[PDB]
Design a binder for this molecule. Structure first.
Ligand SMILES: Cc1cccc2c1CCNC2=O
Length: 350
């Protein structure tokens, strides 16, 4: 049997659940009959990004309608969709194209999960759970619910739940201390930076086997820079509320997973509006979208030298901003070191 603690077993089963992978795909409107989980390949996804990049360019620059039609046909042939009894929409709307770029970001992690699942599982001297856990190459440990470490993190969850997102409550079910293989080493150079904070990162449960094995990553070269508000970086938040929304939970499926990573921000390039950033100004290490609400800078604490903005949501002085909450973006995969993974229970007001 499994040597792992029970919570870790339940966590592994959850991140490797095949049924959830299909639900994700059906939600993106993929045709599961023409495109089964086993047909997904990295190459296939790369090409789809490119097609999206080209069509994005034709819409922006007023390319021929014939061009947009041809690109839409090629995309739907590469990734079969099921629109039911309705006609398939063309990739001629920048918002629909953005939705599709996001679907591909998710398919990239689902593909990693399924590949690992069907990998080397022949060993009979190990429990299936134990075998899959090892495939993550991430040391996972249960954080003691009554320790200081856990107290601080629960304070961070409770105090930073935004006002406009109170359509649900959040209960911390379990906290795991995680350490991905070799991540501490690629992150070493950044301990020399100042302004290192403990920030949030939410994602679907179907993305977690990919996140744990590959770590968080920036979209590939093929993806249009336009598919993302502040360019192709890695996004984080200081309000548990903003990140929780990216968990994509519901009343029917209330358990979400969320990350706490140490991110080396250094000198932030503060922006109040979108900017499809490519190059970063000299002397800047990250981007910070300014929001109307942020944790009370008064209550900020430290946890092993890292700033934890656990203060209550207070209104910042800035008004000429499009954002409601702050967003933090780093453009280097080595600028983040994952620390904790929390199992959250979304209680929806009914
Ligand atoms: C866009 C954005 C801002 C802040 C946090 C997140 C995101 C999307 C990815 N996951 C997040 O938690």
């Amino acid at each position: 049997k499994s040597k792992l603690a029970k919570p870790i077993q339940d966590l592994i089963k959850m991140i490797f659940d095949v049924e959830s992978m299909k639900k994700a795909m059906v939600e993106f409107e993929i045709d599961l009959q023409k495109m089964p989980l086993g047909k997904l390949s990295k190459r296939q996804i790369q090409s789809a990004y490119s097609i999206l990049n080209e069509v994005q360019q034709a819409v922006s620059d007023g390319g021929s309608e014939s061009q947009i039609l041809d690109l839409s046909n090629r995309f739907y042939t590469l990734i079969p969709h099921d629109f039911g009894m309705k006609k398939p929409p063309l990739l001629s709307n920048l918002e629909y194209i953005q939705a599709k770029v996001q679907m591909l970001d998710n398919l990239l992690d689902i593909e990693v999960a399924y590949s690992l699942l069907r990998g080397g599982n022949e060993d009979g001297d190990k429990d299936p759970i134990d075998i899959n856990y090892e495939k993550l190459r991430t040391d996972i440990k249960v954080v003691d619910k009554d320790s200081e470490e856990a107290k601080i993190i629960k304070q961070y969850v409770k105090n930073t739940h935004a006002a406009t997102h109170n359509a649900y409550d959040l209960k911390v079910v379990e906290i795991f201390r995680i350490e991905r293989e070799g991540e501490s080493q690629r992150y070493k150079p950044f301990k020399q930076l100042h302004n290192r904070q403990l920030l949030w990162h939410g994602s679907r449960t179907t993305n977690f086997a990919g996140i744990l094995s590959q770590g968080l990553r920036i979209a590939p070269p093929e993806a249009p820079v336009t598919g993302y508000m502040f360019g192709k970086g890695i996004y984080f938040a200081d309000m548990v509320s903003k990140s929780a929304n990216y968990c994509h939970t519901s009343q029917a499926d209330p358990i979400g997973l969320i990350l706490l990573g140490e991110v080396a921000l250094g000198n932030m390039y503060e922006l109040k509006n979108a900017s499809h950033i490519t190059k970063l100004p000299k002397g800047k290490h990250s981007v910070k979208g300014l929001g109307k609400t942020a944790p009370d800078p008064t209550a900020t604490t430290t946890l092993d030298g890292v700033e934890v903005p656990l203060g209550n949501g207070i209104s910042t002085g800035i008004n000429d901003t499009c954002l409601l909450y702050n967003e933090y973006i780093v453009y280097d995969v080595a600028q983040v070191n994952l620390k904790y993974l929390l199992k959250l229970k979304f209680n929806y007001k009914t």
